[PDB]
Symmetry: C4
Subunit: 217 residues, 4 copies
Amino acid sequence: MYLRITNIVESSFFTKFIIYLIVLNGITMGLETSKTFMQSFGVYTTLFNQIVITIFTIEIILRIYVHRISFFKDPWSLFDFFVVAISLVPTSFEILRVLGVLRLFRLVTAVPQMRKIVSALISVIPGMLSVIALMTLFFYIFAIMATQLFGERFPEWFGTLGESFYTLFQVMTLESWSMGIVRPLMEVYPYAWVFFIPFIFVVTFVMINLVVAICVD
Amino acid sequence: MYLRITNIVESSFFTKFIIYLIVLNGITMGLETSKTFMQSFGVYTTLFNQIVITIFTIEIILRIYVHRISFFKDPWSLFDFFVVAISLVPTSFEILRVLGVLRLFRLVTAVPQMRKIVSALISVIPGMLSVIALMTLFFYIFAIMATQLFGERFPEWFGTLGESFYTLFQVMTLESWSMGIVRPLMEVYPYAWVFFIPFIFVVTFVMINLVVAICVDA
Amino acid sequence: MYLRITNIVESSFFTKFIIYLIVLNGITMGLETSKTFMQSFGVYTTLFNQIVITIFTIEIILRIYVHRISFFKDPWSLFDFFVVAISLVPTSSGFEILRVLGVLRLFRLVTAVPQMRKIVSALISVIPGMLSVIALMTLFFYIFAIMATQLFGERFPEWFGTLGESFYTLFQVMTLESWSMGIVRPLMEVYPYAWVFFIPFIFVVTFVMINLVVAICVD
Amino acid sequence: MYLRITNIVESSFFTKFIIYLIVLNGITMGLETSKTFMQSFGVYTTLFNQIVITIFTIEIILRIYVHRISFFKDPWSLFDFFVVAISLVPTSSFEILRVLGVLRLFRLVTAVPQMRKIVSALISVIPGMLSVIALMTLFFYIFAIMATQLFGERFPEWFGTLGESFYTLFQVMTLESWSMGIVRPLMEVYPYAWVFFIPFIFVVTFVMINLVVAICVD
């Protein structure tokens, strides 16, 4: 019976079908948003999710036996598997349902062309780790400082290695960094800009290089 | 009578005179802006609009007879047709009068060099369709996620897949995303930062490669 | 006697000396910022300023005769010339902003200096390959600045009361600065579909902005 | 004794050990961030800091005698030297050195190699920019000067001093709340103020671009 089921999972019919449910549950998950709607046909819908999830589980279960050890070294179906397993994680923390919406990323898994444009991006990740690790330590060394400078008067923003990491990141984005965060800060600590215009130059400079680093390909 | 209009239509003056009329009315419509202007000379103007509106029909009719099928596979001319039809609709939704202003774009269509710099731009879109579509899926899988997260206390921003799409887009543009959206939210949802800091990395990450792609895809 | 003064103007030191005065006027203009400075040394200071402008007119005049028809074919010296002439114009006859643009003669630093003359000149050469684009933008702006004004100028005169205000506001949206909270979401209170206007504009104007650089790393 | 400390300094483990200890106090200082932590094992900590502060003194003294002048031509070792002396300077009587004590966590880049590199790569890009930077600085200067004696009158918070102007300009340069926050206000009082800031913005933005392509060209 082994060679029987082998024909099912990868038929032209199957993949398009899994894809189909994906776009469907994709849609279906997009409708499960409307409140007007659910009072009319809400039940009609909710079933289909488990359906897709079960099929996607069947798909995910089938995809398992035929490949055996082969299924468990691929990002995509494991993705789907999580995406399915997440989506399989029973209907009641509640985000699995939500990450169940990632099962609409199974669209990325079940559909070609998507798989490619995705993998093309990642190939760039390796050349940046040198830079990223720098950033995280860089942010961290600063997450330590901001906290023990500005946590005095500004506990919302720099009270915590957490909040300082947050607020710093926001300044990195240059979002309300001045009017929203620094000009306030400078009211209490007249010399704060010596921390931030540099933080801004530095992190501004670095981020750029990472890109030139990218345009190495 | 066939071969008559073809030399007119394909004449240097034709190209140059159509272009002439455009620049005329482009000015004219920047004038239809002043209220100061219209209660005095509204008459003189509105007419010239119906005037220009008419000639360009001839041109399009002439260019139609002259190219026949050659015209309606011409983006530049196809555009022309549409951007013409809009302005002809009678004088009273009132937005059409306004869309009547789009007619200043045939200036891109009718003038050489313009057809070209634009075509250069559009031609890049094919290398992007893959990404946009991913984004759109990404945004959607996420506007879905955000909406089935934040619409209770924050119906203004995330009440609808729409405002979520919008807000996400707004967050995407990075305009007031933290002080304005994440920090309020965090007044109520302390770990909201785990949703938006990643969406921000990803939606940003993706946008990046896309540009080196352009500079690299050449 | 012509070649006498001619050899002088083009001396290594002359070049070295004009460059010098620029930096002087550069600084002296920088201390007239402090009221402390002036209430002590308003006398001491203001006097020193007429000195340089005349000299810079002199250089400009010398550079004129020594070069004749050639001087007013020199941007830098013309710059200088105006920058000097700008800097030359009297202290009260009209509007009072002229005293200041003399500070552009501190751009004469860019004019008198060789390595600076260059880096500045390096930037400019990029322009020929882009003119194609800016003009499209400029047009693009015009076509949109027009629409917004006769759309949102009824209710939003601060931002869109005038084709001017619209250009401004459109420009602001372009930078994505407070574009949503500050402008689009407001608009949307009265005109609910405005996002259909701006998301594309934001889509398009941003797009155009991108291609223009690849063109640069192409030139 | 000359040769005794030499194998230690350039040994794999010493390198790994200093490197190791770095990760320790780094964690330790990251815990010196938590107010929570300091009252239980702060002793364990504040002490361990002198522990770390003392051990690391050995290393630099070792590396110095071992390298003598070879030490003070190593940017990387010089930093090591500089960033240590700071951590040694006492607890009283402006209090920020204590805070600067946290910079000794950058030695993780120095003692470790591929970090020494990524740093040098970024730095290497900088020289092709001095021509630019200097212009900026001059440009800013010619412009920061102009602004202060204009708007320090009605808007002294932003432009009362050549300094606040520099700050505000860089803020305008970074484009944060530059419009709603600064120019539109200015225009309520100085109707034509808008003529100054769009140019600084084009230019200073312009300059910044070349600097990238200048970089992406280098």
